[PDB]
Design a binder for this molecule. Sequence first.
Ligand code: HEM
Ligand SMILES: O=C1CCNc2c1cnc1ccccc21
Length: 289
Amino acid sequence: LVHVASVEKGRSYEDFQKVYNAIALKLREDDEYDNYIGYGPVLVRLAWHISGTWDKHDNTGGSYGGTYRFKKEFNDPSNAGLQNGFKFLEPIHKEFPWISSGDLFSLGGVTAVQEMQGPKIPWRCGRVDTPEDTTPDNGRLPDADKDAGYVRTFFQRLNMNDREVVALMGAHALGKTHLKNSGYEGGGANNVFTNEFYLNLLNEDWKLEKNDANNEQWDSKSGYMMLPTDYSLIQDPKYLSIVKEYANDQDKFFKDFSKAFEKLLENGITFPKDAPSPFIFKTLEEQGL
Ligand code: HEM
Ligand SMILES: O=C1CCNc2c1cnc1ccccc21
């Protein structure tokens, strides 16, 4: 099963920079969403969930086919809440209908990370929408009620190692859980991309509690929370070393996250040898916009 990247006909960097800019301007505009968090976090999660269905064994799932647009995936219980992100991106796709769905969904994640003062994420175009019968079944995204061993084994399906896992999880600096979406009671939220997930894990006073949905979560005296899969990163000695590394090195975290996130978003895609180089988009701030 081979998915070959095919550049949207006649498009180049500046076309995609226009899409980035539209997403970025809408992020700035629609600032009230989710108690003034804005849409950055949910767009990052969307980009991860459209990519996280991938299976290295047969190259099913992944970001290439844009299949989140289909009911079966759109309605995956693991994707509850992501419809807000889809609706946010709707007007952008209407403005730029030439872009593929996979390209738009992944680019939304990139734009969100960057506009939230995260690292630059190189991004490649060429995902091509595939038919409804290519939509992966529900159940390929990870459970949150599990331990480090579950996390490690899960991510092997996505060809991610321990450092890549720990780095990717740092996106949980962002946003929050919503009891009605996932069965987890949200704590303090952020909308700036930092290494604070690691600092919170190491520095807060955590207590294991059972929430009103009957699920276990770790809660701090200051009002933050960790999923059991988050907290597993300080229960496992291999993960803990890396958590400490990122808590003590912002730049290393940024560089490792950027690599892992691009790789996550590109898993399953064959880029021809004469494909364009990855694009590094300028932020609104860098453009004076
Ligand atoms: C073991 C792996 C993971 C598990 C079990 C997990 C689970 C969760 C859950 C349960 C939520 C809350 C959803 C809601 O209630 O609205 C959430 C939110 C979020 N996740 Fe993850 N996640 C994992 C990995 C990741 C990765 C790899 C990324 C991206 C690189 C990511 C980015 C996010 C973001 C940005 C949010 C906040 C969304 C918002 O504020 O609406 N997560 N995750
Ligand atoms: O420590 C934080 C910061 C705010 N956001 C999250 C944290 C930890 N785990 C999370 C898990 C899912 C969504 C957001 C978070």
